[PDB]
Design a protein around this nucleic acid. Structure first.
Lengths: 99, 26, 22, 129, 141, 149
RNA sequence: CGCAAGACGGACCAGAGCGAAAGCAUUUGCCAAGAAUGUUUUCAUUAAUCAAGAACGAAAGUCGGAGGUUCGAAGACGAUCAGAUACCGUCGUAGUUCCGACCAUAAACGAUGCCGACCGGCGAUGCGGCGGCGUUAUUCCCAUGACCCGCCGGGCAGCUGGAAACCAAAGUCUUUGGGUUCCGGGGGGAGUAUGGUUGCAAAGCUGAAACUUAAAGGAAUUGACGGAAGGGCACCACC
RNA sequence: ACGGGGAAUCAGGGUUCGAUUCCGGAGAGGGAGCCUGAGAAACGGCUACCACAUCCAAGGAAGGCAGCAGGCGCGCAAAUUACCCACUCCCGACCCGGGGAGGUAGUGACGAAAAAUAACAAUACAGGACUCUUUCGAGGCCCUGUAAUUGGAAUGAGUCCACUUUAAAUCCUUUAACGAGGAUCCAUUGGAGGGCAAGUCUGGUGCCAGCAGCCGCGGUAAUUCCAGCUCCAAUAGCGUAUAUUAAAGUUGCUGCAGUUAAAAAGCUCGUAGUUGGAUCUCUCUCGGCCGAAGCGUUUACUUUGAAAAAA
């Protein structure tokens, strides 16, 4: 039967969507179907901040950030536990997790 | 009536299933 | 059998049959 | 496109009565539509209605009483002879006590009882009960 | 949807007659291939000469041996397997004696656990199998 | 909806209930007709004539003041085009897309749109041949389409 | 640090737009087209659907001509496993790119023909138009662009009768008739055989029967299982 | 596939069948050509070929049952080489002759109608039946029958009589002589798990034999097989096999379905096809209510009127 009303993708009112490659396996997944994360992390982990800050030439340097756009196929996104299977009623929820 | 009920509920799907259900009220 | 491979085997049989026929 | 405006008028009336509304807007108006509504109103099913006159094709605001179970059109307008009318009312009417079949006949548009009284067959427009 | 027009009678009739050919019984009754493939040639019974006796194994859920006879129909010279119905009735039948054979009751469909047998022996040696079974008559000398 | 497009638009003019000549219009029926003849002599199709009269001189509908439609007036005196305005514009659009197709033979959307325009032209020409606005042997053909515009 | 090739157009990019569908994303110019809105313009039934016919139609594939950057059917090797010549890794030929000619098939899908009415509500969003307090930007006399609040029209959506899953259409159906096209008739045999037709080929379109079978299948319940996820537990589990 | 009249369900609509006695057509083993005649391309007429076939003295001659009966053959499948012109009619020169047209018997389950196989005890019983006074107690006031002890009355199936019947006649009908108490003057066919009415009673068999349209019974306590008993269904009738109709709203015009069960063409143009918006209320003659005469723009229509064989 029809598991999802949008077929698990965001394709409405168009025929073809250019595919992208999963960041793990390089699987061809449509850009709307793929699961996209936008990681904005510190280039230095919170454990290594103190050493590089102490050894910094410039006081108040504010360390830069790593910006990465991660695309996942459904299989890799399930395996990496980014998304989980949800109940029939909780599937419909579109609100991102509160974090 | 009770004997038919006993025979039916002993083996509700065995060989003596359709006949007992029919004999119940028909 | 998977239907795609069933069709593929049928097509291969047809190709062999038409090769045998002149 | 919009063919057989009588079908649209009757469908609009039926849908408005299903929703319990007190008034329904029918557009476009037509001579056949007005005659059908008059036949309906003589039997107390539809109550008074008012023809809004715009200069192209009128509309009709039809008051509604909850007295109409169903109003329907018959397409195509089959030519029904007086000997074959009993079969048509057996097919279309809920019982012989009530319900009407509207025929357009050489004597005008009227129910099947008037068509039998006037000994006129014609073409079936629709039915209501 | 279906066309509802005062002048659609040709379209309606042509569509109905074309769609009737997608019906199993209509096609088997009117196409003609079923009648040719019928061993009886469209008859209800047929007389044949018993080619041999044979035992067929019943379909898996129930186990037995059905005592059928391979006969050859006189009219068209076809080979048929006909089920001798009752018990000990195969003893009433010998080799190369004419038997009247009818259908099995399912119009060419095999009946019961018997695989691929759609005929039953009705009469053997011009005397009914029922009469032999009930002892009313004997096999002619 | 549209006969060759999936859209279904409600946009179109809405004539008021009153059919009378408006109060603001002092321009008499014969003066309106004279302006119509001057505009048509300048070489304007009935649609453009009506647009100009409604915009600048000010007329609700020419049919309300003069009693006849603009194309009918032009025919009555006689300055109307040999072939109807809408058919002529459809033929011109077909000619334009055909001329574009010569140096853009890889344009397969222009080919589809030309087919649509030619289907519209054929439908309109059939209608006009029905009503004697066109001769019964009037054909639309690419080799002579530019001869009519 | 440069230089040369091809390929591709990230982030912006969205249940957003356009297109008949296939499909379409770097700037600019040219060419032709298009919907929607506005319209007190024009014609005045010119219309809806469609046998036949026709245009287009992903990828792959075929035939010629350019170029081989990457990836890569086939193939050659390299790897625990009982066995890859499978999944993994390294190479790698056709192909992947463009220009002509074919091919006309996809889970070509919304598995939902098109046109026309009627049928609840809501909040958004795209385009056009209308109305309006206020804040922003081009000299201090305005429109206008960006916001803000509504309205109307069209559009992809979202939310809140059916066997049921579900659907504001899959509703207005035993209270059964708006118009029209294609199309199905238990499961296999079988989209097979054969005939016709198209094609360079692959193959496409149209398409049975003998025979066989009492089920196949749809939706949902309960359990059991899952080399599925989450949370707990046991020295008949481990550490 | 000879056509039609017509035959099989009735919800309405329909779906099939019509070789078959009535009306047409066609043919006489297959073709063809003819004579005579008002009428034939006739075949119970001819001619000659093709295929079969009959006598022969081997020179020749004669053929046509898809007429009536009968044979052979084919097949699942179909009657006795009966009597008669008495009826119906036909033919003829005819009141008179002839008619396998036709009639009347023969042949059994084509089928349809009607309709036997029984109607009435003292008796003990399982009962009950209007206020039963008692579980130990009036029960032909009302009814069913376990019956090795019963009784009268009725009658036709049958065999015979009278020859009514009919063209001798068997036939129903009629009258009469015999003709019933295991009224032996003996009712069968198919079933008993469900569908679907009626036993988990007994004995045998032990996944065997077999039953079972379907689902399913049978692998030593079978409600299903084989038998006994008992019972129910129809009944002089029941079973079976194919065809067919309703069931089948599983062909859907009435009246189906096409998201996921089978299914919407990949998409859009397109001619035929189907469908299509509002809108129209001294013309005419004999006597100061009449036949004629109608282009009202032809229609589809409705509703009358003749004409639509008979069965």
């Amino acid at each position: 039967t029809k598991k999802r009303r949008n077929n698990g993708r965001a394709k409405k009112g168009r025929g073809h969507v250019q595919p992208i490659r999963c960041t793990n396996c390089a699987r061809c997944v449509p850009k709307d179907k793929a699961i996209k994360k936008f990681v904005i992390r510190n280039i230095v982990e919170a454990a290594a901040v103190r050493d590089i800050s102490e050894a910094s030439v410039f006081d108040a340097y504010v360390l830069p950030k790593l910006y990465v756009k991660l695309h996942y196929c459904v299989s890799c996104v399930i395996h990496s536990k980014v998304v989980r299977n949800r109940s029939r009623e909780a599937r419909k929820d579109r609100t991102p997790p509160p974090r | 009536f009770s004997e038919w009920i006993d025979d039916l509920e002993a083996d509700p799907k065995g060989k003596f299933a359709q006949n007992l259900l029919k004999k119940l009220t028909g | 059998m998977r239907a795609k491979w069933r069709k593929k085997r049928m097509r291969r049989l047809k190709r062999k049959r038409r090769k045998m026929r002149q | 496109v919009r063919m057989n405006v009588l079908a649209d008028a009757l469908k609009s009336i039926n849908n408005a009565e299903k929703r319990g509304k007190r008034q329904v807007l029918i557009r476009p108006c037509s001579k056949v539509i007005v005659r059908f509504l008059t036949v309906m109103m003589k039997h107390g099913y539809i109550g008074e209605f008012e023809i809004i006159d715009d200069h192209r094709a009128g509309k009709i605001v039809v008051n509604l009483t909850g007295r109409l179970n169903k109003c329907g059109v018959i397409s195509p307008r089959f030519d029904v002879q007086l000997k074959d009318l009993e079969k048509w009312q057996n097919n279309l009417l809920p019982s012989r006590q009530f319900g009407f079949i509207v025929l357009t006949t050489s004597a005008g548009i009227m129910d099947h009882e008037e068509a039998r009284r006037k000994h006129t067959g014609g073409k079936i427009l629709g039915f209501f009960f | 949807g279906k066309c509802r027009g005062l002048r659609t009678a040709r379209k309606l009739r042509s569509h109905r007659r074309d769609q009737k050919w997608h019906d199993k019984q209509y096609k088997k009754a009117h196409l003609g291939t079923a009648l040719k493939a019928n061993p009886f040639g469209g008859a209800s019974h047929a007389k044949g000469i018993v080619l041999e006796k044979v035992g067929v194994e019943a379909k898996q859920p129930n186990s037995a041996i059905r005592k059928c006879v391979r006969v050859q129909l006189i009219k068209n010279g076809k080979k048929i397997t006909a089920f001798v119905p009752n018990d000990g009735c195969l003893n009433f039948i010998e080799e190369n004696d004419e038997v009247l054979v009818a259908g099995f009751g399912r119009k060419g469909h095999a009946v019961g656990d018997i695989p691929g047998v759609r005929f039953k022996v009705v009469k053997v040696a011009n005397v009914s199998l029922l009469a032999l079974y009930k002892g009313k008559k004997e096999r002619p000398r | 909806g549209r006969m060759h497009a999936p859209g279904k638009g409600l946009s179109q003019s809405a004539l008021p209930y009153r059919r009378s000549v408006p109060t603001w219009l002092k321009l008499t029926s014969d003066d309106v007709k004279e302006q119509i003849y001057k505009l048509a002599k300048k070489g304007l199709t009935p649609s453009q004539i009506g647009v100009i009269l409604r915009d600048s001189h000010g007329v609700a509908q020419v049919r309300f003041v003069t009693g006849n439609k603009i194309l009918r007036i032009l025919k009555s005196k006689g300055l109307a085009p040999d072939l109807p305005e809408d058919l002529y514009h459809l033929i011109k659009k077909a000619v334009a897309v055909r001329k574009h197709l010569e140096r853009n033979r890889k344009d397969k959307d222009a080919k589809f749109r030309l087919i649509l325009i030619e289907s519209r032209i054929h439908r309109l020409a059939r209608y006009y041949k029905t009503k004697r606005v066109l001769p019964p042997n009037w054909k639309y053909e690419s080799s002579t389409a530019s001869a009519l515009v």
